[PDB]
């Protein structure tokens, strides 16, 4: 039941110097070796310190690590902070033959915002001829990514069979999301017109679509 | 050096069994006195150790993983394979085979993490429909106009336009899952109103589990 305790986010400006901790419940950290992983979004981690204070080749030296065994906290020393620092460190141990990992620390250091420009398409006559009909809202081009869509039918807002995407960054630094609304040909046609509404910073962008 | 190399389909079935093999090259499993262990990293989680491996048949588990990993090692091919039973939709992690030394130390080369992902009902084709672009679909000199890729199993999808052509103002967007276990997404470009009835749009969606590619040209509404 021993369990490595690490900050799930940690944020300071570059240049500066960094202390990330990892805790221990029941074991003492001088029981054991501590190992600190630095890993990529989207790659295999690395270790980037291991013997709890001796550095690999290959890392730079600002990459230290102390050990407090009187608070049963493991730190981690980084000092200069750059670009490609932005990870996720997670610290390892060992107990008794149970290797226990960390938490996992977000290392952390801030753009224009921008208007969510938004489109509105029908479903398609192929889509009807195969009995389905799906409305798509998408929204581009703004900052920051936190969005909220809300389908309308006429007037009435819709909820059953709403898909909506997590904002994504783009190429121009901008955010992108997408809103499906799944629904029936019959349905389609019952009400006059749908409309998706999209709702940033306040300000609310509308367009509508109808059966022509 | 050596390297670590991990094969094995990424998808299972739920309450199945798992089989991914990690494979090594450039060294030997039996010399060096080497360890051989697992770790898996669910997205947006920390790391989670399954367990770890020696030459011989010394073996160790996690507990909260006990009695449902199954690690073996095959000398002769100089690769070693992990087995896990009862395998459920919380499964889901980047699984990583991890060449280490010391026990208590480190894993010091890792091998690239395959993507694991508890496979609903049945590979099935993508549902492609046409975004036809309208009056009301666009908001100045420009016009949006796109492919909407829908009903399909498992991912990824692979959309281009015009083979490639056009990579400006495209924009492809994550998968998210629908209401019953299948998936759903779109790619759309920005294009000027003026080359709307003058140039043709294809989008190209391919889906390689399934062997499906389905070209769906993109026309402006026609009112009917």
């Known amino acids: 039941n021993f369990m490595l305790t690490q900050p799930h986010s940690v944020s300071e400006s570059p240049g500066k110097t960094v202390t990330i901790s990892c805790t221990g419940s029941?074991?003492?950290?001088?029981?054991?070796?501590v190992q600190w992983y630095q890993q990529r979004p989207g790659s295999a981690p690395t270790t980037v310190i291991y013997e709890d204070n001796q550095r690999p080749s290959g890392v730079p030296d600002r990459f230290s690590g102390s050990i407090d065994s009187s608070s049963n906290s493991a730190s981690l020393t980084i000092s200069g902070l750059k670009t490609e620092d932005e990870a996720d460190y997670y610290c390892?141990?060992?107990?008794?033959?149970?290797?226990?990992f960390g938490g996992g620390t977000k290392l952390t250091v801030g753009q224009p915002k921008a208007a969510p420009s938004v489109t509105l398409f029908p479903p398609s006559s192929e889509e009807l001829q195969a009995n389905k009909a799906t409305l798509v809202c998408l929204i581009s081009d703004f900052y920051p990514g936190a969005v909220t869509v809300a389908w309308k039918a006429d007037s009435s807002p819709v909820k059953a069979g709403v898909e909506t995407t997590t904002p994504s960054k783009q190429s121009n630094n901008k955010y992108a999301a997408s809103s499906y609304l799944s629904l029936t040909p019959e349905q389609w046609k019952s009400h006059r017109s749908y409309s998706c509404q999209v709702t940033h910073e306040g300000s609310t962008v509308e367009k509508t679509v109808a059966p022509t | 050096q050596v390297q670590l190399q991990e094969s094995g389909p990424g998808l299972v079935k739920p309450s199945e069994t798992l089989s991914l093999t990690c494979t090594v090259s450039?060294?030997?499993?039996?010399?060096?006195?080497?360890?051989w262990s697992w770790i898996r990293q669910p997205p947006g989680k920390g790391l989670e150790w399954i367990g770890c491996?020696?030459?011989?048949?010394?073996?160790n588990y996690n507990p909260s993983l006990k009695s449902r990993v199954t690690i073996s090692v095959d000398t002769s091919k100089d690769q070693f394979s992990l087995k896990l039973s009862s395998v459920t939709a919380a499964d889901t992690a980047v699984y990583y085979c991890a060449r280490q030394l010391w026990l208590r130390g480190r894993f010091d080369y890792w091998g690239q993490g395959t993507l694991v992902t508890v496979s609903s009902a049945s590979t099935k084709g993508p549902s492609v429909f046409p975004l036809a672009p309208s009056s009301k679909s666009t908001s100045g000199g420009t016009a949006a106009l796109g492919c909407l890729v829908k009903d399909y199993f498992p991912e990824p999808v692979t959309v281009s336009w015009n083979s490639g052509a056009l990579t400006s103002g495209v924009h492809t967007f994550p998968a998210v899952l629908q209401s019953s276990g299948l998936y759903s997404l779109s790619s759309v470009v920005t294009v000027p109103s003026s080359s709307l009835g003058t140039q043709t749009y294809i989008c190209n969606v391919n889906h390689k589990p399934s062997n499906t590619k389905v070209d769906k040209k993109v026309e402006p509404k026609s009112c009917d």
């Open positions: 491996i020696y030459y011989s048949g010394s073996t």
């Open positions: 390892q141990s060992y107990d008794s033959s149970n290797v226990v």
């Open positions: 450039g060294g030997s499993v039996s010399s060096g006195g080497y360890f």
């Open positions: 029941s074991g003492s950290i001088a029981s054991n070796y």
